[PDB]
Amino acid sequence: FHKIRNEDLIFNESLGQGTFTKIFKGVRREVGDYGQLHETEVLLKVLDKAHRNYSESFFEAASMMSKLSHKHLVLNYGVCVCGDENILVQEFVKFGSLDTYLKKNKNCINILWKLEVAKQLAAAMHFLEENTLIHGNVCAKNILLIREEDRKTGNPPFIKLSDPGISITVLPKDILQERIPWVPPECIENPKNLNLATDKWSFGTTLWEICSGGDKPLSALDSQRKLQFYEDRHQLPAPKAAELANLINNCMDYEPDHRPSFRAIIRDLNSL
Numbered sequence: 001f002h003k004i005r006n007e008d009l010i011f012n013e014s015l016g017q018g019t020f021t022k023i024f025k026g027v028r029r030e031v032g033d034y035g036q037l038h039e040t041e042v043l044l045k046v047l048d049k050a051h052r053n054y055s056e057s058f059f060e061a062a063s064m065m066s067k068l069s070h071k072h073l074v075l076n077y078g079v080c081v082c083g084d085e086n087i088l089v090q091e092f093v094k095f096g097s098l099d100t101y102l103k104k105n106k107n108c109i110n111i112l113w114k115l116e117v118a119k120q121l122a123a124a125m126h127f128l129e130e131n132t133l134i135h136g137n138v139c140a141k142n143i144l145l146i147r148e149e150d151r152k153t154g155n156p157p158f159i160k161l162s163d164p165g166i167s168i169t170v171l172p173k174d175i176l177q178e179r180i181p182w183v184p185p186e187c188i189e190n191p192k193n194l195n196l197a198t199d200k201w202s203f204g205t206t207l208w209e210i211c212s213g214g215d216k217p218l219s220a221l222d223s224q225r226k227l228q229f230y231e232d233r234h235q236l237p238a239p240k241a242a243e244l245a246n247l248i249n250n251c252m253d254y255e256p257d258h259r260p261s262f263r264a265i266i267r268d269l270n271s272l
């Protein structure tokens with residue numbers, strides 16, 4: 001990672017929290033192309049000092065997103081490790097994360113919007129699958145809306161996939177259980193089972209989010225009941241707008257080897 005000096009970063013408003021992290025809008029002072037000075041809006045992701053022992057996994061998550069370059073993958077600008085800080089500096093996305101956007105805009109998001117976003121997410125995941133690169137935490141909170149839909153210009157929405165955060169392979173078991181049904185059953189059984197098939201299951205859960213207007217699947221179940229949901233081999237209920245429910249369930253296959261390739265997922269989406 002490129003090293004960014006603390007003196008070149010300004011922290012502004014809080015944008016929320018992730019697992020052992022706090023996120024802020026900020027400004028980065030930098031020399032850009034042609035030697036021009038810029039004050040660039042950035043996303044500042046800060047690892048909690050209490051959890052500094054996760055720094056390796058924290059940065060490895062972002063390293064994963066920068067191994068490859070792709071129009072649907074969030075840009076990392078660098079890191080700031082001055083003083084006692086562990087900070088990831090990323091591109092700032094004006095419209096924020098997709099979970100919040102879905103909850104706030106539930107009434108004006110139709111089937112075609114959901115289908116377009118699903119196709120773009122599947123394109124990003126196909127690129128990762130072709131590169132045999134595991135993401136490990138696909139969810140609407142890790143999808144960023146770059147551009148809103150604009151029917152006046154026919155322009156679709158445009159999304160990017162953000163980094164997965166600290167890996168489920170090192171997180172405490174209680175956090176993994178609270179992350180059911182994004183974390184697949186085989187990873188509840190053994191977090192070292194993390195594999196490309198993991199991301200197919202979590203993609204299914206994320207499509208359910210996209211189709212459910214901000215709702216979180218199984219939110220009414222406490223951790224013990226989420227575990228039993230997997231033990232009883234249940235599937236999620238179909239979203240009220242159920243156009244993608246069969247795809248969701250085919251992706252959330254309890255047999256990892258039976259989950260469809262992202263090429264097949266894309267073909268299915270294109271058939272609708």
Ligand SMILES: NC(=O)Nc1sc(-c2ccccc2)cc1C(N)=O
Pocket residue numbers: 015016023043074090091092093094095096097141144162
């Ligand atoms: N890369 C990036 O910008 N990530 C962003 S921006 C954002 C946001 C923006 C405006 C109002 C409220 C929240 C949230 C998050 C996130 N969860 O990552």
